[PDB]
Amino acid sequence: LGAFGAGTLVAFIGGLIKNPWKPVVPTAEGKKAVLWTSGWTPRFKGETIYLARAT
Amino acid sequence: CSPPGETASSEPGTTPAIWTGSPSPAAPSGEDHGGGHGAGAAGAGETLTAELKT
Numbered sequence: 001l002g003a004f005g006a007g008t009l010v011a012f013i014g015g016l017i018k019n020p021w022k023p024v025v026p027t028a029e030g031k032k033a034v035l036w037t038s039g040w041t042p043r044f045k046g047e048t049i050y051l052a053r054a055t
Numbered sequence: 056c057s058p059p060g061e062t063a064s065s066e067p068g069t070t071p072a073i074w075t076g077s078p079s080p081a082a083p084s085g086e087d088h089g090g091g092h093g094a095g096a097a098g099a100g101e102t103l104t105a106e107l108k109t
């Protein structure tokens with residue numbers, strides 16, 4: 001019962017669990033986790049990120 | 056508690072230099088080109104202007 005319950009709960013939850021520090025966001029210094037980056041992270045070296053106004 | 060990093064350090068700073076961006080390796084694999092043509096020479100493309108001076 002304990003082993004089956006552990007396996008079944010792990011099966012339920014593992015769908016939810018996502019590694020927050022999986023390197024997914026591409027960056028000039030290699031793929032990085034989301035929280036380490038934003039739209040201001042240079043996707044490539046010398047990238048020109050304009051401070052564009054939101055009309 | 057206070058966060059580890061703050062304060063000026065009494066350092067004035069310098070005006071940011073004019074930004075000079077580089078080509079896009081991540082987005083562009085190569086170097087994009089403008090006008091196209093046969094251009095059986097060193098290369099001129101499909102765009103070549105001139106200015107008439109007095």
Ligand SMILES: CC(C)=CCC/C(C)=C\CC/C(C)=C/CC/C(C)=C/CC/C(C)=C/CC/C(C)=C/CC/C(C)=C/CC/C(C)=C/CC/C(C)=C\CC1=C(C)C(=O)c2ccccc2C1=O
Binds near residue numbers: 012
């Ligand atoms: C990847 C992934 C997510 C995988 C998971 C899959 C998923 C999404 C869901 C399924 C996962 C799970 C949780 C599976 C296990 C489900 C579960 C709780 C199984 C328990 C069965 C079990 C392990 C028994 C061990 C052997 C043992 C000691 C048995 C005796 C003690 C037990 C468990 C008694 C339970 C009795 C029982 C089934 C009661 C049900 C309650 C209900 C709704 C009704 C009761 C009830 C019954 C059952 C009648 O037949 C009936 C007939 C005529 C008039 C009235 C009734 C009536 O009221």
Ligand SMILES: CCCCCCCCCCCCCCCC(=O)O[C@H](COC(=O)CCCCCCC[C@@H](C)CCCCCCCCC)COP(=O)(O)O[C@H]1[C@H](O)[C@H](O)[C@H](O)[C@@H](O)[C@@H]1O
Binds near residue numbers: 006009010014016017
């Ligand atoms: C008693 C249980 C014993 C087992 C302990 C469970 C924890 C051990 C983890 C070890 C595995 C790590 C290396 C391999 C695996 C790895 O790298 O995955 C990680 C995430 O670990 C997973 O696999 C899913 C985790 C499983 C759910 C565990 C839930 C916690 C347990 C402790 C609670 C229930 C157990 C019963 C106790 C309570 C009893 C109640 C009385 C990171 O995610 P990621 O790299 O993004 O991939 C994502 C895919 O996982 C993901 O399923 C998919 O949804 C996508 O998100 C994908 O992005």
